[PDB]
Structure formats: structure tokens, C-alpha cells
Short mmCIF file of C-alpha atoms and ligand atoms in Angstrom, two decimals:
data_model
loop_
_atom_site.label_atom_id
_atom_site.label_comp_id
_atom_site.label_asym_id
_atom_site.label_seq_id
_atom_site.Cartn_x
_atom_site.Cartn_y
_atom_site.Cartn_z
CA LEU A 1 -24.83 53.90 -142.68
CA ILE A 2 -25.68 50.70 -140.46
CA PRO A 3 -23.36 47.98 -142.14
CA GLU A 4 -22.50 44.08 -141.67
CA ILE A 5 -20.93 43.11 -138.41
CA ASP A 6 -17.87 41.90 -140.34
CA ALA A 7 -17.25 45.41 -141.87
CA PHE A 8 -17.93 47.13 -138.51
CA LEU A 9 -15.36 45.46 -136.50
CA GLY A 10 -11.63 45.98 -137.28
CA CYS A 11 -10.85 42.21 -136.78
CA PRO A 12 -12.04 38.99 -136.09
CA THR A 13 -11.60 37.25 -132.52
CA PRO A 14 -8.12 35.78 -132.40
CA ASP A 15 -7.41 32.02 -132.36
CA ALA A 16 -5.20 32.38 -129.32
CA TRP A 17 -8.47 33.71 -127.39
CA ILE A 18 -10.53 30.78 -128.26
CA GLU A 19 -7.76 28.22 -127.20
CA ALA A 20 -7.77 30.13 -123.73
CA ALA A 21 -11.85 29.97 -123.71
CA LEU A 22 -12.08 26.18 -124.65
CA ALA A 23 -9.58 25.45 -121.64
CA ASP A 24 -11.73 27.30 -119.22
CA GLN A 25 -15.34 26.98 -120.26
CA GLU A 26 -16.56 27.26 -116.70
CA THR A 27 -15.07 30.77 -116.33
CA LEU A 28 -16.40 31.92 -119.75
CA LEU A 29 -19.94 30.86 -118.96
CA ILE A 30 -20.19 32.59 -115.57
CA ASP A 31 -18.77 35.68 -117.17
CA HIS A 32 -21.15 35.57 -119.74
CA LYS A 33 -23.96 35.33 -117.26
CA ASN A 34 -22.48 38.42 -115.85
CA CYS A 35 -22.09 40.36 -119.08
CA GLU A 36 -25.87 39.61 -119.84
CA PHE A 37 -26.68 41.13 -116.48
CA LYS A 38 -24.45 44.07 -116.64
CA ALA A 39 -26.15 44.84 -119.98
CA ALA A 40 -29.42 44.86 -118.48
CA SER A 41 -27.93 47.26 -115.61
CA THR A 42 -26.32 49.56 -118.17
CA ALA A 43 -29.56 49.75 -120.17
CA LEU A 44 -31.45 50.87 -117.01
CA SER A 45 -28.64 53.58 -115.96
CA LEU A 46 -28.99 55.09 -119.58
CA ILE A 47 -32.75 55.27 -118.92
CA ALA A 48 -32.23 57.20 -115.77
CA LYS A 49 -29.70 59.56 -117.26
CA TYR A 50 -31.29 60.14 -120.60
CA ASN A 51 -34.71 60.45 -119.03
CA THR A 52 -36.26 62.65 -121.65
CA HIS A 53 -35.03 60.69 -124.73
CA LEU A 54 -38.34 59.04 -125.36
CA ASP A 55 -36.94 56.40 -128.03
CA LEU A 56 -33.88 55.77 -126.12
CA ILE A 57 -36.03 54.81 -123.31
CA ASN A 58 -38.41 52.48 -125.04
CA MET A 59 -35.48 50.74 -126.62
CA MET A 60 -33.45 50.22 -123.68
CA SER A 61 -36.45 49.22 -121.68
CA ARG A 62 -36.86 46.29 -124.34
CA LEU A 63 -33.20 45.64 -124.59
CA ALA A 64 -32.83 45.24 -120.95
CA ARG A 65 -35.91 42.63 -120.90
CA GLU A 66 -34.11 40.64 -123.53
CA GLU A 67 -30.79 40.89 -121.89
CA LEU A 68 -32.37 39.58 -118.44
CA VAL A 69 -33.81 36.73 -120.42
CA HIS A 70 -30.27 35.69 -121.90
CA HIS A 71 -29.00 36.04 -118.19
CA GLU A 72 -31.76 33.52 -117.17
CA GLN A 73 -30.75 31.30 -120.16
CA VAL A 74 -27.39 31.17 -119.02
CA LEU A 75 -28.19 30.41 -115.59
CA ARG A 76 -30.50 27.47 -116.71
CA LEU A 77 -27.60 26.12 -118.57
CA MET A 78 -25.15 26.47 -115.53
CA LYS A 79 -27.98 24.74 -113.55
CA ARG A 80 -28.02 21.83 -116.25
CA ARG A 81 -24.11 21.36 -116.49
CA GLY A 82 -23.69 21.56 -112.59
CA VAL A 83 -21.74 24.90 -112.90
CA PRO A 84 -21.85 26.79 -109.47
CA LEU A 85 -22.31 30.57 -108.69
CA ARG A 86 -18.74 31.53 -108.24
CA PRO A 87 -17.35 34.96 -108.42
CA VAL A 88 -15.60 36.30 -111.47
CA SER A 89 -14.49 39.65 -111.61
CA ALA A 90 -15.42 42.19 -114.46
CA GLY A 91 -13.19 42.30 -117.48
CA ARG A 92 -11.35 45.61 -118.83
CA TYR A 93 -13.14 45.73 -122.02
CA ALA A 94 -16.24 47.92 -121.40
CA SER A 95 -14.41 50.44 -119.35
CA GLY A 96 -11.69 50.47 -121.75
CA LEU A 97 -14.26 51.42 -124.40
CA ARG A 98 -15.76 54.05 -122.27
CA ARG A 99 -12.30 55.98 -122.03
CA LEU A 100 -13.39 57.07 -125.62
CA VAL A 101 -16.54 58.82 -124.51
CA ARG A 102 -16.32 62.47 -125.08
CA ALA A 103 -16.82 64.66 -122.35
CA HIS A 104 -19.59 67.04 -123.70
CA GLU A 105 -23.39 66.30 -124.38
CA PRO A 106 -24.83 65.95 -126.96
CA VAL A 107 -21.91 64.14 -128.44
CA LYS A 108 -21.37 62.01 -125.38
CA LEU A 109 -24.59 60.32 -125.65
CA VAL A 110 -23.66 59.52 -129.44
CA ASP A 111 -20.34 58.10 -128.28
CA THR A 112 -22.18 56.08 -125.71
CA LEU A 113 -24.60 54.37 -128.20
CA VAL A 114 -21.69 53.71 -130.43
CA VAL A 115 -19.72 51.81 -127.76
CA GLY A 116 -23.03 49.89 -127.03
CA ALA A 117 -22.85 49.07 -130.82
CA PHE A 118 -19.37 47.84 -130.75
CA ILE A 119 -20.11 45.54 -127.45
CA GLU A 120 -23.14 44.05 -128.98
CA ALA A 121 -21.18 43.84 -132.38
CA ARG A 122 -18.27 41.93 -130.85
CA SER A 123 -20.53 39.51 -128.87
CA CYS A 124 -22.13 38.49 -132.04
CA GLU A 125 -18.87 37.92 -133.54
CA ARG A 126 -17.19 36.02 -130.86
CA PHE A 127 -20.23 33.94 -130.44
CA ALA A 128 -20.01 32.92 -133.98
CA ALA A 129 -16.29 32.32 -133.68
CA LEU A 130 -16.75 29.86 -130.86
CA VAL A 131 -19.66 27.90 -132.18
CA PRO A 132 -17.89 25.43 -134.26
CA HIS A 133 -15.66 24.40 -131.40
CA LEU A 134 -18.24 23.75 -128.80
CA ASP A 135 -20.26 21.01 -127.71
CA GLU A 136 -23.73 20.80 -129.42
CA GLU A 137 -25.91 21.85 -126.41
CA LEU A 138 -23.73 25.11 -125.76
CA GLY A 139 -22.91 25.78 -129.52
CA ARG A 140 -26.65 25.62 -130.37
CA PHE A 141 -27.30 28.28 -127.79
CA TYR A 142 -24.53 30.40 -128.68
CA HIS A 143 -25.73 30.37 -132.38
CA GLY A 144 -29.14 31.31 -131.25
CA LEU A 145 -27.75 34.28 -129.50
CA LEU A 146 -26.20 35.69 -132.45
CA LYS A 147 -29.34 37.06 -133.87
CA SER A 148 -30.23 38.81 -130.89
CA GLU A 149 -26.68 40.42 -130.83
CA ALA A 150 -27.30 41.50 -134.32
CA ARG A 151 -30.50 43.26 -133.42
CA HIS A 152 -28.99 44.85 -130.50
CA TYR A 153 -25.99 46.27 -132.54
CA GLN A 154 -28.59 47.66 -135.09
CA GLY A 155 -30.45 49.08 -132.40
CA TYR A 156 -27.74 51.07 -130.74
CA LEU A 157 -26.76 52.48 -134.25
CA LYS A 158 -30.19 53.31 -135.22
CA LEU A 159 -30.48 55.41 -131.93
CA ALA A 160 -27.08 56.71 -132.84
CA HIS A 161 -28.31 58.32 -135.88
CA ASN A 162 -31.40 59.54 -134.23
CA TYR A 163 -29.48 61.60 -131.97
CA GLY A 164 -26.50 62.49 -133.93
CA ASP A 165 -24.91 63.49 -137.29
CA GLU A 166 -23.98 61.41 -140.15
CA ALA A 167 -20.08 62.41 -140.24
CA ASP A 168 -19.58 62.61 -136.49
CA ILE A 169 -20.88 59.24 -136.17
CA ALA A 170 -18.70 57.99 -138.88
CA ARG A 171 -15.60 59.37 -137.12
CA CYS A 172 -16.80 58.12 -133.85
CA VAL A 173 -17.16 54.48 -135.58
CA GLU A 174 -13.54 54.92 -136.84
CA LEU A 175 -12.13 55.88 -133.76
CA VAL A 176 -14.02 53.29 -131.28
CA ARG A 177 -13.16 50.59 -134.05
CA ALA A 178 -9.40 51.14 -133.59
CA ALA A 179 -9.56 50.94 -129.68
CA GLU A 180 -11.63 47.94 -129.71
CA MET A 181 -9.49 46.01 -131.85
CA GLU A 182 -6.57 46.93 -129.57
CA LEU A 183 -8.41 45.74 -126.52
CA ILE A 184 -9.11 42.40 -128.57
CA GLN A 185 -5.75 41.72 -129.88
CA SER A 186 -3.48 43.02 -127.03
CA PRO A 187 -2.41 40.81 -124.15
CA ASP A 188 -4.76 40.41 -121.22
CA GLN A 189 -3.91 38.77 -117.96
CA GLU A 190 -7.32 37.02 -117.36
CA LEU A 191 -9.79 35.08 -119.53
CA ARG A 192 -13.07 36.84 -119.73
CA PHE A 193 -15.64 36.66 -122.54
CA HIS A 194 -14.28 40.12 -124.06
CA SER A 195 -10.68 39.77 -122.89
CA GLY A 196 -7.76 40.23 -124.77
CA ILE A 197 -5.13 37.50 -125.47
CA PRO A 198 -4.03 35.90 -122.34
CA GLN A 199 -0.41 35.81 -121.70
CA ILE B 1 -49.50 34.33 -97.70
CA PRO B 2 -52.46 36.29 -96.62
CA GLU B 3 -54.63 38.17 -98.56
CA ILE B 4 -53.56 41.55 -99.70
CA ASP B 5 -56.41 43.17 -97.43
CA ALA B 6 -55.23 41.53 -94.42
CA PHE B 7 -51.71 42.34 -95.18
CA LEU B 8 -52.20 46.03 -94.99
CA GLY B 9 -53.14 48.04 -92.20
CA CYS B 10 -55.27 50.59 -94.09
CA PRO B 11 -56.74 51.36 -97.26
CA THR B 12 -56.09 54.26 -99.43
CA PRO B 13 -57.66 57.41 -97.99
CA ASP B 14 -60.31 59.27 -99.69
CA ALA B 15 -58.29 62.40 -99.90
CA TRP B 16 -55.47 60.54 -101.63
CA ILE B 17 -57.95 59.37 -104.48
CA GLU B 18 -59.51 62.91 -104.72
CA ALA B 19 -56.05 64.57 -105.29
CA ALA B 20 -54.89 61.64 -107.70
CA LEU B 21 -58.17 61.99 -109.64
CA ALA B 22 -57.41 65.68 -110.11
CA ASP B 23 -53.74 65.34 -111.28
CA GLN B 24 -53.70 62.16 -113.52
CA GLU B 25 -50.77 63.47 -115.47
CA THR B 26 -48.57 63.41 -112.28
CA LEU B 27 -50.12 60.28 -111.21
CA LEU B 28 -49.09 58.53 -114.48
CA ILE B 29 -45.66 59.89 -114.79
CA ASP B 30 -44.82 58.73 -111.31
CA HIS B 31 -46.58 55.47 -111.83
CA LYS B 32 -44.22 55.01 -114.88
CA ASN B 33 -41.14 56.00 -112.83
CA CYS B 34 -42.17 53.53 -109.99
CA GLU B 35 -42.44 50.58 -112.73
CA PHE B 36 -38.90 51.65 -113.51
CA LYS B 37 -37.69 51.74 -109.92
CA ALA B 38 -39.14 48.48 -109.13
CA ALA B 39 -36.93 46.90 -112.19
CA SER B 40 -34.04 48.74 -110.94
CA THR B 41 -34.55 47.68 -107.52
CA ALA B 42 -34.90 44.06 -108.61
CA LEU B 43 -31.43 44.14 -110.78
CA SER B 44 -29.79 46.07 -107.55
CA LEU B 45 -30.96 43.08 -105.40
CA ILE B 46 -29.77 40.53 -108.20
CA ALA B 47 -26.01 42.24 -107.88
CA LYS B 48 -26.01 42.44 -104.11
CA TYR B 49 -27.29 38.63 -103.33
CA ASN B 50 -25.81 37.33 -106.58
CA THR B 51 -25.29 33.68 -105.07
CA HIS B 52 -28.93 33.31 -104.07
CA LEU B 53 -30.25 31.49 -107.08
CA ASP B 54 -33.71 31.57 -106.09
CA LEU B 55 -33.75 35.22 -105.50
CA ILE B 56 -31.92 35.97 -108.81
CA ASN B 57 -34.30 33.78 -110.68
CA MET B 58 -37.36 35.61 -109.27
CA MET B 59 -35.89 39.19 -109.32
CA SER B 60 -34.61 38.57 -112.97
CA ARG B 61 -38.39 37.82 -113.86
CA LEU B 62 -39.86 40.47 -111.66
CA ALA B 63 -37.54 43.05 -113.29
CA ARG B 64 -38.77 42.09 -116.70
CA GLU B 65 -42.40 42.28 -115.79
CA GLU B 66 -42.01 45.87 -114.23
CA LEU B 67 -40.30 47.04 -117.67
CA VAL B 68 -43.41 45.78 -119.44
CA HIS B 69 -45.44 48.05 -117.11
CA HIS B 70 -43.26 50.99 -117.81
CA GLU B 71 -43.45 50.32 -121.30
CA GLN B 72 -47.04 50.22 -121.13
CA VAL B 73 -47.27 53.41 -119.19
CA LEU B 74 -45.33 55.05 -121.64
CA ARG B 75 -47.51 53.99 -124.42
CA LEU B 76 -50.56 55.30 -122.60
CA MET B 77 -48.71 58.58 -122.01
CA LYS B 78 -47.87 59.00 -125.90
CA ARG B 79 -51.47 58.25 -127.07
CA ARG B 80 -52.79 60.68 -124.58
CA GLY B 81 -49.93 63.29 -124.99
CA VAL B 82 -48.62 63.11 -121.62
CA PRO B 83 -44.96 64.31 -122.15
CA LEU B 84 -41.98 63.03 -120.24
CA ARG B 85 -41.80 65.79 -117.69
CA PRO B 86 -39.27 64.89 -115.08
CA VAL B 87 -41.09 64.18 -111.49
CA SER B 88 -39.27 63.75 -108.44
CA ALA B 89 -39.49 60.53 -106.14
CA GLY B 90 -41.87 60.62 -103.49
CA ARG B 91 -40.78 59.93 -99.91
CA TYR B 92 -42.56 56.28 -99.27
CA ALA B 93 -39.74 53.89 -100.51
CA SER B 94 -37.02 55.85 -98.76
CA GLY B 95 -39.31 56.12 -95.65
CA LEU B 96 -39.57 52.09 -95.66
CA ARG B 97 -35.97 51.46 -96.18
CA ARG B 98 -35.10 53.33 -93.11
CA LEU B 99 -36.70 50.28 -91.45
CA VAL B 100 -33.74 47.92 -92.86
CA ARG B 101 -31.46 46.52 -90.30
CA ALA B 102 -27.79 46.56 -91.20
CA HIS B 103 -26.53 43.00 -90.75
CA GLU B 104 -27.58 39.86 -92.78
CA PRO B 105 -29.63 38.04 -93.06
CA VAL B 106 -32.19 40.26 -91.27
CA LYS B 107 -31.24 43.09 -93.67
CA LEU B 108 -32.53 40.89 -96.54
CA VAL B 109 -35.60 39.73 -94.45
CA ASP B 110 -36.48 43.39 -93.95
CA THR B 111 -35.69 44.33 -97.66
CA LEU B 112 -38.07 41.61 -98.84
CA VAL B 113 -40.69 42.40 -96.53
CA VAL B 114 -40.82 46.04 -97.55
CA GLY B 115 -40.97 44.84 -101.33
CA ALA B 116 -44.02 42.74 -100.35
CA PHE B 117 -45.56 46.02 -98.80
CA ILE B 118 -44.83 48.24 -101.64
CA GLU B 119 -46.32 45.59 -104.32
CA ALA B 120 -49.53 44.98 -101.93
CA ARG B 121 -50.08 48.74 -101.40
CA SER B 122 -49.66 49.56 -105.22
CA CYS B 123 -52.12 46.32 -105.93
CA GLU B 124 -54.59 47.92 -103.17
CA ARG B 125 -54.18 51.53 -104.72
CA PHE B 126 -54.80 50.58 -108.11
CA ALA B 127 -58.06 48.74 -106.93
CA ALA B 128 -59.18 51.85 -105.10
CA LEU B 129 -58.84 54.03 -108.16
CA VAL B 130 -60.26 51.68 -110.79
CA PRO B 131 -63.96 52.64 -110.31
CA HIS B 132 -63.20 56.38 -110.83
CA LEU B 133 -61.02 56.30 -114.02
CA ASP B 134 -62.06 56.34 -117.60
CA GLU B 135 -62.81 53.05 -118.93
CA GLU B 136 -59.52 52.31 -120.75
CA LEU B 137 -57.32 53.38 -117.83
CA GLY B 138 -59.52 51.73 -115.34
CA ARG B 139 -59.25 48.46 -117.24
CA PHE B 140 -55.30 48.77 -117.56
CA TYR B 141 -55.15 49.40 -113.76
CA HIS B 142 -57.41 46.47 -112.86
CA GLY B 143 -55.09 44.07 -114.90
CA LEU B 144 -51.94 45.36 -113.21
CA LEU B 145 -53.91 44.24 -109.74
CA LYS B 146 -53.09 40.43 -110.43
CA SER B 147 -49.48 41.03 -111.30
CA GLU B 148 -48.63 43.13 -108.16
CA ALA B 149 -50.41 40.38 -106.08
CA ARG B 150 -48.20 37.81 -107.42
CA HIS B 151 -45.07 40.00 -106.83
CA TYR B 152 -46.36 40.66 -103.23
CA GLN B 153 -46.64 36.77 -102.89
CA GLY B 154 -43.10 36.20 -104.21
CA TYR B 155 -41.43 38.69 -102.13
CA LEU B 156 -43.03 37.25 -99.15
CA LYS B 157 -42.43 33.76 -100.13
CA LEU B 158 -38.84 34.74 -100.55
CA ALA B 159 -38.73 36.04 -97.15
CA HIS B 160 -39.32 32.75 -95.56
CA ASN B 161 -36.17 31.36 -96.90
CA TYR B 162 -34.43 33.63 -94.36
CA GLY B 163 -36.12 33.98 -91.31
CA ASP B 164 -38.43 31.53 -89.29
CA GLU B 165 -42.13 32.18 -89.37
CA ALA B 166 -42.40 34.03 -86.32
CA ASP B 167 -39.54 36.31 -87.10
CA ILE B 168 -41.07 37.25 -90.50
CA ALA B 169 -44.55 37.67 -88.84
CA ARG B 170 -43.05 40.12 -86.45
CA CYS B 171 -41.18 41.90 -89.30
CA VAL B 172 -44.78 42.15 -91.38
CA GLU B 173 -45.98 43.66 -87.95
CA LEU B 174 -43.47 46.40 -87.91
CA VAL B 175 -43.35 47.13 -91.46
CA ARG B 176 -47.23 47.39 -91.48
CA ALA B 177 -47.33 49.88 -88.65
CA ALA B 178 -44.64 52.06 -90.37
CA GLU B 179 -46.22 51.71 -93.91
CA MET B 180 -49.59 52.69 -92.59
CA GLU B 181 -48.12 55.83 -90.90
CA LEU B 182 -46.70 56.86 -94.16
CA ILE B 183 -49.76 56.40 -96.12
CA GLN B 184 -52.05 58.31 -93.47
CA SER B 185 -49.81 61.09 -92.70
CA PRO B 186 -49.50 64.65 -94.37
CA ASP B 187 -47.80 64.91 -97.72
CA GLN B 188 -47.47 68.17 -99.71
CA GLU B 189 -46.77 66.27 -103.09
CA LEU B 190 -48.98 63.99 -104.99
CA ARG B 191 -47.23 60.93 -106.08
CA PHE B 192 -48.35 57.13 -106.54
CA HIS B 193 -47.36 56.14 -103.10
CA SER B 194 -47.76 59.94 -101.43
CA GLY B 195 -49.69 60.60 -98.32
CA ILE B 196 -52.66 62.89 -97.60
CA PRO B 197 -53.00 66.61 -98.24
CA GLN B 198 -52.26 69.36 -95.72
O1 PER C 201 -24.84 40.74 -123.98
O2 PER C 201 -24.89 41.99 -124.72
FE1 FE C 202 -27.43 39.61 -124.56
FE1 FE C 203 -27.31 42.51 -126.35
FE1 FE C 204 -45.30 46.62 -111.49
FE1 FE C 205 -44.69 45.10 -109.13
#
């Protein structure tokens, strides 16, 4: 398969989420820094767990390097804007999606790779949603991250097909799409980069 | 920052080289795993010392280089039909981690000094092997020397942000003695940082 990001996601970022993000951009930016690092950390955990899946290892090693660069780019921007390293707790999103990962191998891996495609897919969509509302410096940076995010999305789907069956993958995608949109549109008590709508 | 030769207490023993040369498949696979654990350890430090800006910047870059090394070893493996055979971790790194004190900032000091030692030893050990390997592999290993030397220097420079000059020197004295004992003591497995046979 491997479709366009707009067709993969079940909904766009709500306007109510954007309004919350614009009114607390510093929290956003720090969380973002954190997301880029978690993505690298998760990538390395996949390599340790699936330590005989050669294509996954090579892809995850590269993805982690790329995510670290993102991490460093956000830090460089935080510095330029005088944004300190203050603690911001992990949002609910990723753990929410991981509750959908099946129990047994080899389908557990497939679901794990699909969730990664959704996280990347969502990030790309949300960066795109924000760009028009941000200042030039931050908007230009976010716009540049879109293409990496799409590349990461495609990478997870390609791994999925490599280790999974066409129809199983299509069903998984359908089920993760529903749970993801619920995490995105449901109320949330905090503002994170992948939070729901703050109430 | 002293030269790597002055930093280590001993060179790599002959019996280790002879064993390494006789099982280059285990050598390569374990080396690949060390590059991976070097990256993993760097991200772990970042998570742990997440407000130390110089530290996170240095470890972020270091992790990225280790992941290139990992990818490099894997490509060499594929070319030579060396499979992804699971290989258990050796004792060296956990042996050195026992030296780490429990309270900050000396915990971090000890941690960084240990990092410098691992890197310095890898640099010395690649060097000791180079003249005995096939051309391609030997030149690849020579090329990693410069990199490990920079990692060694980074760890040690960073350690100087957390302990005065005499305290870091004392830390280094103690870690050197321990590292040498790990390198020269009998070991049953062959691993990149394993000891000697029997
Ligand atoms: O950030 O993925
Ligand atoms: Fe990223
Ligand atoms: Fe990504
Ligand atoms: Fe390395
Ligand atoms: Fe290194």
C-alpha cells in the first residue's frame, strides 16, 4: 500500500489544539525536544529487542541518528530563543497507541511498526498545521521537518510490509487510525505536542 | 588530556590478540554490539542528566557517531557473510561500573572517567590489532582510532566540569588500576574488551 499522509490519518489537527499551542509555545518546544529524543531512544530499544531483524536494525540505527539531529536542532533553537531546560512530563499519546499492540509475535512487531508510522504521520501533519501560524524562524524550521517525518512514516510502513502480510497490515492500520484520532480529538488535561484538546 | 598511551595502565596482551585473530567472527559481532551499547549508554546519560546542556550536546553527537560505527560494522559483516548471531555481553563494562559511587556529582565524575577508559582502551586495542588483520579490515580499524581518541578526550574534558583537577586525577588513578586488572585477568570468553585465556 503506502498512501499519502492525509489519507493515512483519520483527521487533521483540531483548531482548538493549535490555539492552545500558540499560547504556550515554550512548553511545546521543550516537549518537542523531548519527543525527538524519545524517538531515538525507542529506535534503539527496537534494535535491542528485534536483534536478528537485519533491515529493521539498519533502518532504526539511521532513524535514531536523524532523530538525534532533530533533538540537537531543537536545543539549538531553544538556546537562540533563551528557552531553558525545564521539565515537561511525557504526554499520553504514545502509551495510548501502544495499548493497541497485540500480544503475540510476529504480529506484535507489525503493530509496533504501524504505531511508529502513525506517530511520524501525525507529527508531519501537525507541523504542517502549525507553520502558517508561527513566526518565520520557527515556521521555517518546522516546515523543514515535514519531509523527514514523511520519510520516517514511509520507513515504518515499508518495514511493516517487509515483516507482515498485506491484509493483516490493512486491518491494523484501520484499528490504529481509529484509536489515534480519538487520542487527538478527545479532551486532554495538558498541552503536549501530541496532546488531545486541552479542557 | 594525556595521550592514550599515558592514560592506560597496560597494552592489550598478546594472548588476547592471538585469541581475537582466531575468532574474528565473534570479534566483529561483539564490536558491533559495543558500538550499539556505546550509543545506548550515551542516550541513557542524556536522559539521566537532562539539564546538563554541554553533556547532552556532547552525548547526542557521540551517540550519532557510535551508530555510524555500528552501521559500518554491520555493512562489513553483510559483505563477508557474518550473520547476526546473538553474542552475550562481556564483563568489562559492568566490572568498571561497579567502581561508580552512589552520590552526585562524584557518581557522574566516575561515570565519565569510566567512559574515557572504555574509549581509550578501544582505541589502543584497535591499534594493537591493525597490523595483523586483512588490509580492508585493518584500515577500517585504523580509521576508528582517531574517532575513539576524540571520544576519550570528550569524556575526560566533560569530567573536569564536575570535579577539581586533583579529584579527577585521583579518579583516573583508581579507574586505571581497575581497568588494567580487568584487561589482564583470566577470562573464558573472547569479546572485544575481554581479558586473557585460562
Ligand atoms: O519525531 O519523530
Ligand atoms: Fe524527528
Ligand atoms: Fe521521526
Ligand atoms: Fe565507536
Ligand atoms: Fe566511541
